């Protein structure tokens, strides 16, 4: 019941109230509460935050302190004992394509972003965290336990920086720490267009009144486009190969070049915008640049919503889909569309879906060259392999023909992410995504595994047998209690992902609830949802129902053979058909006439 109008977002965005378009920042979606779902604001809390001192200090910070009478185990040790494996044999998903993983990162990047605070103009602190492993202020290092192979090569810890929080983004006082979400909570294609009016303008091609997005002028892809280079130095993408001099791509989301395949889909979406705009120019010659931009932006936003809710989510949630996300009944403005803090860790279920290699396939879907199959760790912040080694076509073919990694309780996260992660600030391929996630759970003030179990209306195990029944695994349950000593202290990330998957889905009971509650809210609480009457005309909606990710590939690449259902495991040549068998997006109903 204290400071409720706090924060430090964009000082000026007034509502048009009659505009048929979304705001870049995400304001004016809810008319009663204008800033609901907007960017640069605190993540929603579904349960009260849990800190060591109940305000901002994470569990694990102080040696002498306990959580419920027990020490919290080092994140890297939880990683070493539970999360890791060596044998990549027989871990693939027999009915999920690599796109299934890839679309998850796209949707995620559209919904949430808690940025780290590493910021001072020039700093002694960046050094103080990395070189000397000194815990203090925003520095919260991930220590190596005894007998870690990384003691011998990497030092005593992995540098880790606490995420930004609201109100004085600089320092602190009362209530609990709330972390910022730097993107719009709506599934509104923020990753293509930006969440700031500043950035959203720089990505646009304002040189001509054609409503196009800016493209790369130095490099091309068989006559097709790339996002422009991000020319801020130092560049993580230039670092990995100083000979190539190929920088990171510049999109609406700042993580767009984190991996080769993420940059691949960012390029497809950027291409689709221009393809839509040039089509809308033909049909409507009198339309100015702004309408061409906005109208295309609106179509692509719906595209991402249709693909997510029709094609992706049912195969994630499975039998739980209908329980949490019932048929659409119209816009409910009493629904909180805000992304919760816990969703940002719930969605991280996909880090266990990431395989150890990325393939490049040719026009006959066979290996493309002597170096066709590459280790994932060589592909973090790698733009040079796109631009200087064959374009995005052999990469897109790989997404369709290769499999995702299946979750296993014995084989959780691949070493390519668990030992050899690259991060943009630093220089080694030696970070641990699993250890980072668990440290981030604590940084963000997450309640334990049982608090969420209670929140989702599920049983709360207290004993080994109770946990053995839930996890349906004696070893995993024993290994978790050996570290956590109680099911109350188990970090949400590791707890949720250890549960056996629901029927026809890829997350367990707890995650299905957490994910299911959120996706429902962002859909029900969005005024510009594609099915909401008045957002699109009836004829427009009949066009948008026939879109597919297959069609996206057909219109925007020189790939000619695609599967009809791209999110499932397909084999060449049987499951693949010519692009002419795939329904096109008809833009006829967008043609407007004067009289
Ligand atoms: C190789 C591909 C990927 C790489 C290299 C990668 C890397 C990362 C990194 C470094 C972070 C920051 C973690 C933190 O500081 O808390 C992150 C966050 C996250 N990742 Fe990924 N990721 C990948 C794919 C995916 C996929 C496929 C999904 C889902 C299907 C996903 C879901 C998430 C979510 C929800 C967050 C937190 C977003 C936020 O709220 O800030 N990631 N990822
Ligand atoms: C913003 O939009 C303008 C106008 O659409 C872009 O300018 C155009 O850029 C294209 C592609 O580089 C040029 O077309 C080229 O045509 C020549 C001759 O046909 C051909 O040899 C090239 O291979 C290529 O197809 C064209 O010169 C140019 N047109 C105009 C009106 O100047 C511009 O690239 C966009 N700017 C950004 C930053 O995205
Ligand atoms: C792979 O899994 C998908 C996902 O369930 C299966 O696709 C289903 O196909 C049936 C028709 O046989 C439809 O009624 C379902 O709606 C589909 N599921 C969804 C929600 O997409 C498919 O059966 C599996 N494919 C193979 C070859 O095993
Ligand atoms: C750094 O990038 C360059 C590309 O700029 C890579 O070198 C190319 O590799 C292929 C295959 O050997 C050759 O066809 C090109 O001629 C090479 N380019 C030049 C001019 O060197 C190189 O492999 C990358 N290096 C590392 C270590 O990743
Ligand atoms: C809107 O959502 C709220 C909160 O979940 C719910 O109580 C209410 O029944 C919904 N309103 C309508 C009319 O659907
Ligand atoms: Ca968004």
XYZ file of C-alpha atoms and ligand atoms in Angstrom:
748
model
C 0.000 0.000 0.000
C 2.949 2.330 -0.734
C 4.224 4.274 -3.799
C 1.944 2.919 -6.569
C 2.718 5.529 -9.270
C 6.478 4.923 -9.245
C 8.900 4.150 -12.117
C 10.994 5.895 -14.796
C 9.564 5.164 -18.301
C 8.825 7.386 -21.339
C 7.589 10.729 -19.871
C 5.326 11.612 -22.835
C 2.824 9.452 -24.760
C -0.769 10.758 -24.889
C -3.606 8.581 -26.170
C -5.253 9.016 -29.580
C -8.226 6.888 -28.398
C -9.625 6.633 -31.952
C -6.450 5.364 -33.673
C -6.746 1.924 -35.338
C -3.043 1.247 -34.655
C -0.942 0.056 -31.705
C 1.578 2.364 -30.084
C 5.231 1.296 -30.321
C 5.640 1.659 -26.533
C 2.455 -0.352 -25.899
C 0.532 2.453 -24.170
C -3.150 3.214 -24.875
C -4.101 -0.459 -25.234
C -6.179 -0.270 -22.061
C -8.179 2.992 -22.056
C -8.912 3.015 -18.318
C -5.313 2.237 -17.317
C -3.132 3.620 -20.194
C 0.212 2.184 -18.993
C -1.000 -1.416 -18.578
C 1.156 -3.703 -20.761
C 3.531 -0.896 -21.770
C 7.334 -1.201 -21.974
C 9.940 -0.050 -19.406
C 7.694 -0.850 -16.434
C 7.850 -3.337 -13.564
C 7.081 -6.992 -14.253
C 3.788 -8.105 -12.700
C 3.957 -10.173 -9.494
C 1.568 -13.113 -9.022
C 3.098 -13.952 -5.641
C 4.938 -11.590 -3.282
C 8.689 -11.418 -3.947
C 11.068 -13.389 -1.730
C 14.353 -11.760 -0.754
C 16.930 -12.534 1.959
C 16.197 -9.219 3.710
C 12.713 -9.120 2.166
C 13.503 -6.166 -0.132
C 16.337 -6.478 -2.676
C 19.066 -8.854 -1.446
C 18.894 -12.278 -3.186
C 19.002 -15.690 -1.527
C 22.605 -16.915 -1.774
C 24.150 -13.470 -1.301
C 25.247 -13.932 2.317
C 27.042 -17.032 3.635
C 25.554 -17.129 7.154
C 21.926 -16.569 6.107
C 19.560 -19.442 5.379
C 16.375 -19.937 3.403
C 13.958 -21.851 5.666
C 16.837 -23.054 7.873
C 18.877 -24.358 4.929
C 21.692 -22.996 2.771
C 20.793 -22.433 -0.865
C 23.131 -24.495 -3.097
C 25.434 -22.792 -5.618
C 23.723 -22.436 -9.008
C 26.729 -23.956 -10.814
C 26.608 -27.031 -8.541
C 22.888 -27.545 -9.207
C 23.921 -27.296 -12.869
C 26.819 -29.794 -12.620
C 24.835 -32.464 -10.722
C 21.361 -32.248 -12.287
C 21.340 -30.272 -15.528
C 24.361 -31.648 -17.410
C 25.099 -34.716 -19.531
C 27.692 -35.836 -22.115
C 25.865 -38.192 -24.474
C 24.012 -36.268 -27.212
C 22.880 -39.620 -28.664
C 19.097 -40.140 -28.669
C 18.024 -36.739 -27.306
C 16.148 -35.378 -30.347
C 12.378 -34.818 -30.452
C 10.837 -37.412 -32.766
C 7.775 -35.228 -33.502
C 9.055 -31.640 -33.121
C 11.087 -29.768 -35.732
C 13.857 -27.274 -34.864
C 11.380 -24.478 -35.645
C 9.400 -25.522 -32.541
C 12.352 -24.337 -30.455
C 12.949 -21.356 -32.743
C 9.431 -19.933 -32.599
C 9.590 -20.158 -28.812
C 12.505 -17.744 -28.721
C 10.687 -15.405 -31.108
C 7.537 -15.262 -28.959
C 9.586 -14.944 -25.761
C 11.602 -12.064 -27.154
C 8.311 -10.377 -28.067
C 6.874 -10.714 -24.561
C 9.642 -10.105 -21.984
C 13.073 -8.543 -21.435
C 14.717 -7.798 -18.116
C 17.969 -5.995 -18.934
C 21.037 -6.234 -16.705
C 22.463 -3.235 -14.921
C 26.080 -3.200 -15.971
C 25.967 0.502 -16.550
C 28.416 3.279 -15.913
C 30.048 5.324 -18.728
C 33.474 3.814 -18.028
C 33.746 1.596 -14.926
C 35.977 0.057 -12.236
C 33.064 -2.246 -11.265
C 32.915 -4.353 -14.469
C 36.526 -5.277 -13.708
C 35.892 -5.783 -9.976
C 33.237 -8.422 -10.753
C 35.095 -10.334 -13.492
C 38.735 -10.293 -12.369
C 38.434 -10.566 -8.590
C 34.991 -12.180 -8.182
C 33.990 -9.576 -5.578
C 30.302 -9.624 -4.721
C 28.851 -6.152 -4.259
C 26.138 -3.878 -5.500
C 25.002 -5.019 -8.945
C 27.747 -7.633 -9.114
C 26.364 -11.047 -8.106
C 28.943 -13.608 -9.316
C 28.300 -17.281 -9.991
C 30.941 -19.091 -7.930
C 32.483 -22.387 -8.992
C 32.078 -25.239 -6.525
C 34.884 -27.592 -5.495
C 36.278 -29.794 -8.295
C 34.783 -27.774 -11.176
C 36.806 -28.216 -14.381
C 36.393 -24.469 -14.811
C 38.534 -23.662 -11.776
C 41.513 -24.773 -13.855
C 40.730 -22.700 -16.966
C 38.335 -19.846 -16.141
C 39.040 -18.557 -12.637
C 36.915 -18.620 -9.498
C 33.540 -17.476 -10.852
C 31.352 -16.416 -13.766
C 30.546 -12.682 -13.823
C 26.831 -12.022 -13.374
C 24.993 -8.709 -13.121
C 21.652 -8.002 -11.450
C 18.740 -6.936 -13.635
C 17.363 -3.445 -13.536
C 14.610 -2.583 -11.214
C 11.967 0.137 -11.222
C 11.723 3.614 -9.630
C 15.276 4.810 -9.235
C 16.873 2.608 -11.704
C 20.180 3.506 -9.900
C 19.826 2.642 -6.102
C 17.032 1.442 -3.585
C 14.322 1.736 -0.768
C 10.947 0.257 0.330
C 8.638 -2.405 -1.155
C 10.266 -5.314 -2.732
C 12.533 -5.064 -5.839
C 10.504 -5.256 -9.023
C 12.415 -5.933 -12.241
C 11.775 -4.050 -15.492
C 10.301 -5.411 -18.714
C 11.836 -3.417 -21.597
C 9.396 -4.670 -24.250
C 5.598 -4.583 -24.684
C 3.602 -7.351 -22.975
C 1.389 -7.838 -26.016
C 2.235 -10.242 -28.807
C 2.595 -7.268 -31.113
C 5.792 -7.908 -33.139
C 7.902 -5.661 -30.859
C 10.959 -7.673 -31.916
C 10.643 -6.429 -35.514
C 9.566 -2.843 -34.789
C 11.081 -1.851 -31.435
C 9.516 -0.914 -28.100
C 10.841 2.639 -28.088
C 9.677 5.407 -30.423
C 13.357 6.383 -30.841
C 14.530 2.964 -32.074
C 11.327 2.265 -34.020
C 12.073 5.273 -36.220
C 15.705 4.306 -36.928
C 14.672 0.896 -38.256
C 12.245 2.475 -40.728
C 13.128 3.527 -44.261
C 11.916 7.125 -44.132
C 13.976 8.034 -47.254
C 10.991 7.066 -49.399
C 7.213 7.296 -48.796
C 6.793 3.546 -49.313
C 6.463 2.439 -45.672
C 9.417 0.065 -45.886
C 11.840 -0.926 -43.137
C 15.537 -0.097 -43.531
C 17.710 -2.859 -45.002
C 21.450 -3.572 -45.321
C 23.188 -1.604 -48.080
C 26.549 -3.427 -47.991
C 25.414 -7.081 -48.150
C 22.669 -8.929 -50.041
C 21.210 -12.448 -50.267
C 20.602 -13.491 -53.892
C 18.657 -10.241 -54.324
C 16.931 -10.555 -50.946
C 17.416 -8.369 -47.864
C 19.219 -8.427 -44.513
C 18.592 -6.231 -41.466
C 21.076 -3.310 -41.325
C 24.344 -3.748 -39.413
C 24.458 -2.465 -35.850
C 27.506 -0.189 -35.984
C 28.099 0.359 -32.260
C 31.655 -0.602 -31.218
C 32.666 -2.858 -29.588
C 30.619 -5.501 -31.418
C 30.198 -9.056 -30.070
C 29.687 -10.324 -33.636
C 32.943 -8.837 -34.917
C 34.882 -10.203 -31.928
C 34.270 -13.902 -32.706
C 35.999 -13.469 -36.100
C 38.121 -10.315 -36.428
C 39.131 -11.350 -39.969
C 35.540 -11.263 -41.282
C 34.562 -7.832 -39.836
C 30.873 -8.793 -39.832
C 28.870 -6.976 -37.102
C 25.542 -7.861 -35.456
C 22.199 -7.248 -37.161
C 20.016 -4.356 -36.010
C 16.398 -5.223 -35.190
C 13.684 -4.123 -32.729
C 15.002 -6.551 -30.126
C 18.649 -6.176 -28.977
C 19.172 -9.928 -28.709
C 18.422 -10.591 -32.403
C 21.966 -11.808 -33.171
C 22.371 -14.043 -30.109
C 22.406 -17.123 -32.372
C 22.531 -17.752 -36.127
C 19.005 -19.226 -36.267
C 17.451 -16.358 -34.288
C 18.918 -13.864 -36.763
C 17.546 -16.078 -39.564
C 13.891 -15.663 -38.481
C 14.402 -11.944 -37.702
C 15.404 -11.623 -41.377
C 12.324 -13.507 -42.632
C 10.003 -11.229 -40.615
C 11.823 -8.065 -41.741
C 11.501 -9.275 -45.356
C 7.781 -10.034 -44.940
C 7.099 -6.460 -43.771
C 8.534 -4.969 -46.976
C 6.804 -7.666 -49.073
C 3.472 -6.700 -47.477
C 4.116 -2.956 -47.837
C 5.025 -3.190 -51.550
C 1.881 -5.262 -52.103
C -0.245 -2.710 -50.204
C 1.266 0.051 -52.366
C 0.116 -1.701 -55.563
C -3.424 -2.135 -54.208
C -3.569 1.348 -52.638
C -1.465 3.826 -54.695
C -2.824 6.848 -52.802
C -1.589 5.577 -49.401
C 1.198 7.602 -47.776
C 4.285 6.056 -46.119
C 2.869 6.080 -42.585
C -0.249 4.054 -43.499
C 1.855 1.568 -45.487
C 4.073 1.051 -42.422
C 1.210 0.813 -39.899
C -1.020 -1.436 -42.052
C 1.829 -3.895 -42.707
C 2.893 -3.728 -39.036
C -0.675 -4.659 -38.099
C -0.793 -7.662 -40.494
C 2.576 -9.066 -39.317
C 1.489 -8.623 -35.688
C -1.590 -10.753 -36.386
C 0.593 -13.294 -38.223
C 2.679 -13.823 -35.059
C -0.534 -14.200 -32.992
C -2.204 -16.711 -35.363
C 0.932 -18.881 -35.668
C 1.495 -18.811 -31.878
C -2.055 -19.597 -30.733
C -3.094 -21.936 -33.564
C 0.135 -23.819 -34.375
C 2.690 -23.514 -31.552
C 0.868 -23.377 -28.199
C -1.371 -26.448 -28.699
C 1.775 -28.560 -29.217
C 3.456 -27.041 -26.140
C 0.561 -27.271 -23.663
C -1.020 -30.403 -25.160
C -3.983 -31.675 -23.161
C -3.698 -28.644 -20.833
C -4.266 -26.143 -23.690
C -8.085 -26.235 -23.438
C -8.003 -26.073 -19.619
C -6.054 -22.799 -19.448
C -6.771 -21.163 -22.820
C -10.491 -21.625 -23.731
C -12.116 -20.395 -27.014
C -12.034 -16.621 -27.602
C -15.035 -14.684 -26.246
C -13.904 -11.090 -26.830
C -11.807 -8.356 -25.224
C -11.949 -8.271 -21.423
C -10.476 -4.973 -20.177
C -10.486 -6.098 -16.533
C -7.807 -8.646 -17.471
C -4.191 -7.812 -16.618
C -2.202 -8.228 -19.862
C 1.112 -7.576 -18.058
C 3.879 -10.171 -18.227
C 4.584 -11.595 -14.767
C 8.075 -12.099 -13.348
C 7.588 -15.907 -13.109
C 6.624 -16.184 -16.815
C 10.143 -15.006 -17.691
C 11.496 -18.154 -16.001
C 8.613 -20.422 -16.996
C 9.207 -19.751 -20.714
C 12.877 -20.740 -20.223
C 11.649 -24.336 -20.640
C 12.993 -23.985 -24.193
C 16.660 -23.930 -23.148
C 16.286 -27.689 -22.753
C 14.891 -27.854 -26.293
C 18.131 -26.529 -27.816
C 20.256 -29.178 -29.618
C 24.070 -29.316 -29.821
C 24.472 -28.738 -33.589
C 23.019 -26.544 -36.371
C 22.964 -27.898 -39.934
C 22.994 -26.148 -43.299
C 21.192 -28.073 -46.033
C 21.154 -27.555 -49.813
C 18.397 -27.469 -52.464
C 18.029 -31.288 -52.297
C 18.026 -31.124 -48.453
C 21.443 -32.820 -48.298
C 24.435 -31.493 -46.259
C 25.690 -28.176 -47.691
C 29.481 -28.341 -48.042
C 32.335 -29.914 -46.018
C 31.359 -27.867 -42.955
C 27.585 -28.414 -43.154
C 27.043 -29.298 -39.469
C 28.381 -26.790 -36.919
C 28.602 -26.806 -33.081
C 26.091 -24.412 -31.469
C 28.770 -22.664 -29.370
C 30.536 -21.517 -32.551
C 27.267 -19.852 -33.561
C 26.580 -17.385 -30.729
C 26.704 -13.819 -32.092
C 27.660 -15.252 -35.481
C 26.533 -13.094 -38.400
C 29.511 -13.911 -40.645
C 28.243 -17.463 -41.259
C 25.016 -16.002 -42.662
C 26.554 -13.261 -44.805
C 29.840 -14.891 -45.855
C 28.767 -18.557 -45.939
C 25.663 -19.146 -48.074
C 22.825 -16.846 -46.963
C 19.799 -17.851 -44.880
C 18.389 -20.499 -47.267
C 20.529 -23.440 -46.073
C 19.790 -22.360 -42.480
C 16.000 -22.202 -43.021
C 16.020 -25.666 -44.658
C 17.756 -26.987 -41.522
C 14.991 -25.595 -39.298
C 12.400 -27.597 -41.264
C 14.320 -30.866 -41.702
C 16.208 -31.211 -38.380
C 14.758 -32.064 -34.950
C 14.601 -30.133 -31.681
C 16.065 -31.576 -28.495
C 13.587 -33.469 -26.335
C 13.551 -32.793 -22.610
C 14.930 -35.642 -20.528
C 15.189 -35.714 -16.724
C 18.646 -37.279 -17.210
C 19.657 -35.044 -20.131
C 18.483 -31.464 -19.501
C 20.662 -28.736 -21.102
C 23.350 -29.274 -23.780
C 27.022 -28.494 -22.974
C 27.041 -26.004 -25.863
C 24.879 -23.854 -23.568
C 25.849 -25.240 -20.145
C 29.634 -24.906 -20.497
C 30.307 -22.970 -23.683
C 27.821 -20.067 -23.754
C 29.093 -16.781 -25.143
C 27.881 -13.494 -23.672
C 28.073 -10.128 -25.512
C 30.106 -8.251 -22.877
C 32.791 -10.857 -22.180
C 35.376 -12.745 -24.226
C 35.280 -16.474 -23.371
C 32.999 -19.213 -24.695
C 32.647 -20.413 -21.096
C 29.390 -19.303 -19.471
C 26.581 -21.548 -18.206
C 22.987 -20.808 -19.232
C 21.596 -23.203 -16.593
C 23.680 -21.611 -13.802
C 22.706 -18.119 -15.016
C 18.986 -19.044 -14.976
C 19.108 -20.287 -11.372
C 21.096 -17.268 -10.166
C 18.550 -15.080 -12.019
C 15.651 -16.815 -10.232
C 17.169 -15.646 -6.942
C 18.163 -12.209 -8.288
C 14.494 -11.664 -9.286
C 13.209 -12.697 -5.836
C 11.299 -15.820 -6.885
C 9.245 -17.801 -4.375
C 10.221 -21.501 -4.225
C 8.830 -24.493 -6.151
C 6.077 -25.293 -3.617
C 4.736 -21.717 -3.540
C 4.041 -21.997 -7.269
C 2.704 -25.532 -6.884
C 0.169 -24.102 -4.401
C -0.551 -21.189 -6.749
C -1.387 -23.604 -9.589
C -3.706 -25.748 -7.446
C -1.305 -28.693 -7.307
C 0.096 -30.810 -4.467
C 3.011 -29.451 -2.417
C 5.568 -32.215 -1.657
C 7.407 -32.043 1.676
C 9.091 -35.463 1.662
C 11.297 -37.538 -0.658
C 8.428 -39.949 -1.460
C 6.087 -37.018 -2.157
C 8.632 -35.583 -4.596
C 9.303 -39.057 -6.082
C 5.605 -39.366 -6.920
C 5.494 -35.935 -8.578
C 8.726 -36.220 -10.592
C 8.147 -39.953 -11.220
C 11.913 -40.369 -10.789
C 13.680 -41.644 -7.630
C 17.189 -40.456 -8.573
C 16.220 -36.938 -9.714
C 14.093 -36.367 -6.589
C 16.901 -37.665 -4.349
C 19.484 -35.540 -6.177
C 17.340 -32.414 -5.790
C 16.763 -32.880 -2.040
C 20.472 -33.613 -1.557
C 21.150 -30.070 -2.794
C 17.979 -28.225 -1.762
C 17.254 -30.203 1.461
C 13.536 -29.395 1.074
C 11.070 -29.063 -1.821
C 10.291 -25.517 -0.544
C 13.678 -24.130 -1.616
C 13.888 -25.645 -5.121
C 14.269 -22.805 -7.657
C 11.207 -22.400 -9.910
C 13.222 -22.924 -13.114
C 14.665 -26.316 -12.129
C 11.485 -27.413 -10.300
C 9.094 -26.737 -13.183
C 11.294 -28.372 -15.816
C 11.938 -31.544 -13.787
C 8.240 -32.520 -13.811
C 7.256 -35.127 -16.428
C 5.635 -33.641 -19.543
C 1.850 -33.563 -19.899
C 0.131 -35.671 -22.577
C 0.820 -34.397 -26.129
C 2.723 -31.418 -24.673
C 6.298 -30.392 -23.853
C 5.940 -28.907 -20.360
C 4.821 -30.452 -17.058
C 1.700 -29.659 -14.938
C 3.172 -26.599 -13.160
C 4.645 -24.969 -16.273
C 1.463 -25.683 -18.272
C -0.418 -23.655 -15.646
C 2.069 -20.759 -15.464
C 2.428 -20.508 -19.272
C -1.289 -21.146 -19.814
C -2.428 -18.417 -17.400
C -0.140 -15.826 -19.040
C -0.899 -16.480 -22.730
C -4.618 -16.348 -21.908
C -4.171 -12.977 -20.174
C -2.155 -11.334 -22.989
C -4.801 -12.514 -25.486
C -7.905 -11.625 -23.434
C -6.346 -8.344 -22.263
C -5.224 -7.109 -25.676
C -7.519 -4.576 -27.348
C -5.850 -5.164 -30.725
C -6.163 -8.967 -30.729
C -6.712 -10.115 -34.323
C -10.129 -11.673 -33.559
C -11.505 -8.729 -31.571
C -14.386 -7.250 -33.647
C -13.420 -3.941 -35.270
C -9.661 -4.552 -35.327
C -9.866 -6.334 -38.692
C -12.811 -6.502 -41.099
C -14.505 -9.899 -41.567
C -12.981 -10.446 -45.026
C -9.550 -9.554 -43.609
C -9.826 -12.248 -40.918
C -10.791 -14.868 -43.525
C -7.508 -14.054 -45.262
C -5.377 -14.182 -42.092
C -6.620 -17.661 -41.137
C -4.796 -19.169 -44.122
C -1.315 -17.934 -43.129
C 1.404 -20.430 -42.168
C 5.132 -20.317 -41.380
C 5.527 -22.460 -44.517
C 4.113 -19.573 -46.596
C 6.503 -17.152 -44.858
C 9.431 -19.256 -46.131
C 7.935 -19.486 -49.648
C 7.410 -15.736 -50.120
C 10.687 -14.615 -48.525
C 13.334 -17.196 -49.491
C 14.351 -19.086 -52.629
C 13.413 -22.366 -50.952
C 10.773 -24.142 -53.019
C 10.046 -27.323 -51.009
C 8.336 -26.900 -47.612
C 6.180 -28.996 -45.231
C 2.493 -28.154 -44.625
C 2.819 -28.477 -40.838
C 6.235 -26.964 -40.093
C 6.298 -27.415 -36.300
C 6.367 -31.225 -36.441
C 9.107 -33.657 -37.495
C 9.206 -33.855 -41.296
C 11.360 -35.989 -43.576
C 12.554 -35.234 -47.115
C 11.236 -35.836 -49.712
C 7.950 -37.361 -48.505
C 6.529 -34.696 -46.170
C 7.746 -31.783 -48.348
C 5.645 -30.186 -51.123
C 6.085 -27.358 -53.664
C 5.177 -23.838 -52.459
C 2.211 -23.778 -54.871
C 0.323 -26.238 -52.619
C 0.582 -23.756 -49.734
C -2.224 -21.198 -49.346
C -1.178 -17.603 -50.041
C -2.136 -14.577 -47.956
C -4.762 -12.729 -49.983
C -4.496 -8.967 -49.455
C -7.551 -8.080 -51.592
C -9.703 -6.979 -48.592
C -7.093 -4.299 -47.752
C -7.913 -2.410 -50.965
C -9.862 0.728 -50.080
C -11.635 3.087 -52.502
C -12.401 6.851 -52.321
C -16.173 7.195 -53.018
C 20.455 -20.807 -29.080
C 19.335 -20.127 -28.819
C 19.192 -19.267 -27.540
C 20.157 -18.606 -26.889
C 21.650 -18.565 -27.283
C 19.555 -17.936 -25.749
C 20.193 -17.144 -24.814
C 19.579 -16.438 -23.797
C 20.220 -15.571 -22.821
C 21.732 -15.265 -22.731
C 19.267 -15.085 -22.017
C 19.457 -14.121 -20.827
C 19.248 -14.907 -19.534
C 19.203 -13.975 -18.355
O 20.070 -13.063 -18.268
O 18.302 -14.156 -17.497
C 17.995 -15.625 -22.440
C 16.775 -15.350 -21.868
C 15.561 -15.947 -22.126
N 15.326 -16.999 -23.008
Fe 16.752 -17.607 -24.385
N 18.205 -18.230 -25.754
C 17.950 -19.045 -26.837
C 16.726 -19.561 -27.200
C 15.552 -19.497 -26.480
C 14.328 -20.203 -26.796
C 14.161 -21.149 -28.008
C 13.411 -19.882 -25.863
C 11.945 -20.377 -25.765
C 11.439 -21.327 -26.559
C 14.033 -18.957 -24.924
C 13.451 -18.380 -23.810
C 13.983 -17.370 -23.029
C 13.267 -16.511 -22.101
C 11.770 -16.504 -21.726
C 14.314 -15.574 -21.503
C 14.056 -14.456 -20.471
C 13.489 -13.253 -21.221
C 13.269 -12.098 -20.278
O 12.187 -12.040 -19.640
O 14.177 -11.234 -20.168
N 15.334 -18.749 -25.336
N 18.221 -16.443 -23.529
C 14.876 2.880 -48.764
O 14.092 2.719 -49.931
C 14.709 3.172 -51.121
C 13.669 3.155 -52.237
O 12.965 1.932 -52.218
C 15.930 2.299 -51.437
O 16.619 2.790 -52.577
C 16.766 1.777 -53.601
O 17.673 0.752 -53.256
C 17.576 -0.347 -54.140
C 18.285 -1.548 -53.515
O 19.622 -1.221 -53.193
C 18.129 0.027 -55.524
O 17.647 -0.920 -56.468
C 18.808 -1.422 -57.142
O 18.534 -1.130 -58.499
C 19.658 -1.264 -59.354
C 19.127 -0.909 -60.720
O 17.847 -1.569 -60.891
C 20.231 -2.669 -59.371
O 21.396 -2.741 -60.213
C 20.535 -3.043 -57.935
O 20.996 -4.389 -57.907
C 19.290 -2.867 -57.050
O 18.214 -3.707 -57.464
C 17.732 1.446 -55.981
O 18.845 2.036 -56.621
C 17.220 2.431 -54.909
N 16.129 3.223 -55.459
C 15.961 4.527 -55.222
C 14.570 5.061 -55.407
O 16.865 5.287 -54.872
C 16.887 2.264 -50.237
O 17.812 1.211 -50.401
C 16.189 2.099 -48.883
N 17.102 2.511 -47.830
C 17.318 1.787 -46.732
C 18.275 2.364 -45.731
O 16.778 0.703 -46.520
C 3.056 -35.039 -34.100
O 2.351 -34.350 -33.086
C 1.320 -33.509 -33.576
C 0.836 -32.602 -32.445
O -0.257 -33.177 -31.755
C 0.186 -34.343 -34.190
O -0.686 -33.479 -34.908
C -2.083 -33.762 -34.652
O -2.702 -34.388 -35.766
C -4.057 -34.770 -35.570
C -4.556 -35.482 -36.826
O -4.032 -36.793 -36.861
C -4.919 -33.544 -35.245
O -6.243 -33.929 -34.941
C -4.331 -32.765 -34.068
O -5.036 -31.554 -33.891
C -2.840 -32.481 -34.280
N -2.277 -31.870 -33.088
C -2.098 -30.554 -32.963
C -2.772 -29.900 -31.792
O -1.417 -29.884 -33.742
C 0.707 -35.460 -35.109
O -0.204 -36.537 -35.048
C 2.108 -36.018 -34.804
N 2.710 -36.475 -36.048
C 3.287 -37.671 -36.202
C 3.636 -38.056 -37.613
O 3.542 -38.441 -35.269
C 36.636 -16.123 -40.159
O 35.844 -15.755 -41.274
C 36.409 -16.023 -42.545
C 35.441 -15.493 -43.595
O 35.616 -14.099 -43.721
C 36.694 -17.518 -42.754
O 37.581 -17.694 -43.848
C 36.936 -18.182 -45.047
O 36.716 -19.584 -45.002
C 36.276 -20.258 -46.187
C 36.489 -21.760 -45.976
O 37.818 -22.009 -45.516
C 36.983 -19.816 -47.479
O 36.219 -20.208 -48.600
C 37.205 -18.309 -47.539
O 38.070 -18.021 -48.615
C 37.804 -17.789 -46.240
N 37.966 -16.346 -46.306
C 39.138 -15.745 -46.093
C 39.485 -14.604 -47.007
O 39.917 -16.081 -45.200
C 37.358 -18.151 -41.520
O 37.208 -19.554 -41.571
C 36.829 -17.644 -40.172
N 37.748 -18.057 -39.121
C 37.391 -18.689 -37.997
C 38.525 -19.165 -37.140
O 36.227 -18.890 -37.641
C -13.224 -10.334 -17.207
O -12.180 -10.884 -16.417
C -12.414 -10.827 -15.018
C -11.138 -11.200 -14.254
O -10.717 -12.516 -14.554
C -13.607 -11.726 -14.672
O -13.919 -11.663 -13.294
C -14.840 -11.325 -15.487
O -15.815 -12.339 -15.373
C -14.541 -11.077 -16.971
N -15.630 -10.302 -17.539
C -16.431 -10.751 -18.508
C -17.738 -10.021 -18.662
O -16.155 -11.698 -19.251
Ca 5.431 -7.290 -27.423
